[PDB]
Amino acid sequence: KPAVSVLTMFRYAGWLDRLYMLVGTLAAIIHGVALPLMMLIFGDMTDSFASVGQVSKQSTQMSEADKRAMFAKLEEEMTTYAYYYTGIGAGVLIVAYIQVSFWCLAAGRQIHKIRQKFFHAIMNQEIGWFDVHDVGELNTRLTDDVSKINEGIGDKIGMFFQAMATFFGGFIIGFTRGWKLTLVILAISPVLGLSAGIWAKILSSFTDKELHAYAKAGAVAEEVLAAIRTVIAFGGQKKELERYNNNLEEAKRLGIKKAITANISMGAAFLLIYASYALAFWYGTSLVISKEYSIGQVLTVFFSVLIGAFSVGQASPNIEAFANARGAAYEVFKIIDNKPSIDSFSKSGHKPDNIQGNLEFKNIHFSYPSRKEVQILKGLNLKVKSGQTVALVGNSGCGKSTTVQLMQRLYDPLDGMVSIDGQDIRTINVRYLREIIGVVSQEPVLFATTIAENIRYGREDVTMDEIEKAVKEANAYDFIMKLPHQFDTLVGERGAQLSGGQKQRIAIARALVRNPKILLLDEATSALDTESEAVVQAALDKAREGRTTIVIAHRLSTVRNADVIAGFDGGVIVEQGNHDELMREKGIYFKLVMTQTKEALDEDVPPASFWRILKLNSTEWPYFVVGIFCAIINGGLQPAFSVIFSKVVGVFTNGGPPETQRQNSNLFSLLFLILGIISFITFFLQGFTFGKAGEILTKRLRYMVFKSMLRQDVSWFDDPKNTTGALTTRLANDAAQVKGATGSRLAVIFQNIANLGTGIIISLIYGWQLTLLLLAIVPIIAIAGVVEMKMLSGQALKDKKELEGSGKIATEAIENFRTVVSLTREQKFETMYAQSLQIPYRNAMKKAHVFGITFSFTQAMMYFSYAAAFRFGAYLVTQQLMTFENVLLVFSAIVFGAMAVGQVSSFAPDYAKATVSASHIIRIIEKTPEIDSYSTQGLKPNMLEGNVQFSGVVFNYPTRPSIPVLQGLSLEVKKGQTLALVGSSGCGKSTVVQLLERFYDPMAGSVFLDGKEIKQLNVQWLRAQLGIVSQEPILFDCSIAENIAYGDNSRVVSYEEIVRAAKEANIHQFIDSLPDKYNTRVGDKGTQLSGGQKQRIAIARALVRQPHILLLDEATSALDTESEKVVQEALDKAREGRTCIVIAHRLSTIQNADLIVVIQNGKVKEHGTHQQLLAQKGIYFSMVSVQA
């Protein structure tokens, strides 16, 4: 992975940026050291209480003279401690605000310069850069990668310096307060980073191993879901379900292990930190007994050292964000610093005023930059006199267009020169070069605006009268004036779709507005109907007037009118001259003449569910039984520590027998280790209870999901929201994440209720008023913890929804780059981009202020909490209310328990995302289709007859109930006779075939098979004897024998049936000859096949089941030569003795049909045979006269 140097990345930082960064980091430094100072003042606080305990504990000395030396002493000490706590907090809000504000600010100001300079950099690039680069990743890189460079030069590094200031501040306060104890804890430290390091490598080994493990099942997932139509047709839903399942109990089982190791890792971490507590307290409290360190110092160095150590843990991801940001900026700064060969953005050449118009190509040797191994132009020599129209022909290769592309100087020639008049094309300015050169490309392109605005892109300073005039010159004035909103009518991609000739003529107007002295026409009339070609060419012929024109047309009808015809054979121009010469010489030209004669849309719709999801995992009780008790133990483990922590510092503050200090000390420290051991047990156990659970729940669930997915109707697969990728994504992620909302949530809710629950009872017995204070303060801060991520992600989505405006501009300008560069007008797009960007950048200031005051509001309060609880608590202890040990207990129970529920909440996956991903699963499963392929009801007769009849039957597609397809057409087909379906296009030529295959239910009317209604028949059995052949046949990546035998399921096909169906489809000759026989894989993973052969396989497939009805729907549209003969030759022998329905556009093979039905609109207007419908002189007579 690449990476820019650090110094290089902040290049766009100015005076104010460097100022903001230095001041921000300086605030982050002093903010970072606030917390350790808070621990120092906490130790100096506890030392004051430990003095008041031991005197009032043993016997009785002075009752009236205690209140002056104890009660009055602690008040005087706390009145200062409160000023220290509150002072520090008051500083915290200030420096935090400076920190986040200034950083988010300066970073934003740099990002604003970066995205702009990046966009200009892209526009500045030449077309050769676009040849080697995918535009798709380029367009997304402007949004994703710049937003990614934004993160990591913002608040992230302010928090990095804060975390490091906390590290250094913690170790400095540690060593400053204690020499030995800090060394002891730090001696325990290396065993943690080594443990965290090894366990992070273990699960990440299984994580990357899981991805290519399910990819095997996801392979058959998309293969089926893509081919589903052919699946439901052949009903292999049983076999495809089994095939999908076979790869499931292979992948997830491997995931079980990872789950377990992840829990073991977490348990190891807790064991080790608990061991650190036990050890540090064992040494510290043994150290206070020899009267070296005080009680407060042990707490001070322990807390400052721990905090300083965990500070690294909180500095790791922030520095990570900065790391990939430099990796992201390499690609972007590469494009910016890239200066193109053709600029094209400034003027450095000449701008001739003659401007004359003579074209010359002298010795042009050129090859494309993408493929340099192949040379296109080899010594091209071509001259065009003034105002002369030259046509290029020869059907050589890309070279024709290359000349056009060379002429507007998109590419510079490898050898030789293109000269307009006496000067080279390179000696003249590019912008001015393309202003004097007009171009009309093969595919017309209009931007999404008014017609007028599409014209303005041709030239900006155009008055409305000039626009109209230019439209009238383009014969486009007629239809524009018929448009509803006239010249203000929208066009382009979205809204108001126009026909190709109209779109092209608007473009011609656009080019005519620039008034170029040279006009280039590259396949202008191509890909157009003969009716629009007339008008477009009518405009073009009038656009060639007084201009030097070089024209390329595939259709040679419009070529002859040119002044000079130049032929292309290979890379060199051979024959050049007038029409009569090129006919008389019988060259290439003469040969050509004789031969041519959805993400957001998903999660929004589902309602529900609350705790219904647990029923999905309810298949396994025992795991949950052990899991709840387990989670209760690990949960009640936390209040235990609040007691034992208070008991250690309690033995040194509350006084008591010194001979019992050691005895108790070693008890409680050791106790902590026990407390660690048990915590290791829980995480080992939970991993075997909920850990397996959610995985089993996954496998079974995917199975279930997939089954229901095949149960679904075809109309459900037509729903735009359910795509093969969306279904495979639903199946891959949402199904597996459901476990986040089942057992994990019970674990979280039980560890939480055990912790804060039992802890609150304990703190309620040992404290009354203080407990009531903390259960007030804590929830208030918790809500602040919620609002923090509410206003953070809330204004984050708002910032993106206001950036989609620019994203549209840059997207449209990049996707059509090859078009805009021909019209210049790049700088115009830059202008529109900056104008679009000015709005979100004006909100960046307010953004920073809001983020600042919010971060400071969450953080400031935190210190003030301490300041409240300890002031009020000291007020409690100073009086008859006891004691201090219980103050510290209540505090540690409620507060550390509150943080503990936060950690537990951060363990489990996102419950919201889990429930929403769950709802899609429960809905996909409980989804009952109209037509059910799984039903075991139905008639199942003996009668092999097979008479097809459509009576009434009016249908319209459920996806788009606009313009019904069948308006009640009726027909009939008896056994052995073949039906023929004729019409202008599809709907409902193919809808008949789909309806007989029962993919849909018509709204009114009925379709009968024999004497029975179809709806009465068994669903699967109906399709059991229906042969279906589509326009593009598909095979499964299994094998050939399986493909052929895929025709008939629920039966052993064996060698005999496959060879028997092979020999009649005439495919047996292609099998033995190609190594090897039947074992070969089709396709794309095996040996490729031509359309004809694969189609013959598709025939053999539908022929195995011995169907009494064949449905042939536009069978071979792409088949050519003699390949089409043998296919239909194999169809004709298998059509005898069967009911057949043929849809073809050929109309040549329909003449032999028994019945020919012409279907127009929604009904049947013509019925009869070929000669019968021919002698009728109806619409069939109009359609069959185009055969000549």
Ligand SMILES: [Hg+2]
């Ligand atoms: Hg920011």
Ligand SMILES: [Hg+2]
């Ligand atoms: Hg080309």
Ligand SMILES: [Hg+2]
């Ligand atoms: Hg547990």
Ligand SMILES: [Hg+2]
């Ligand atoms: Hg379609």
Ligand SMILES: [Hg+2]
């Ligand atoms: Hg259709």
Ligand SMILES: [Hg+2]
């Ligand atoms: Hg297969």
Ligand SMILES: [Hg+2]
């Ligand atoms: Hg047929």
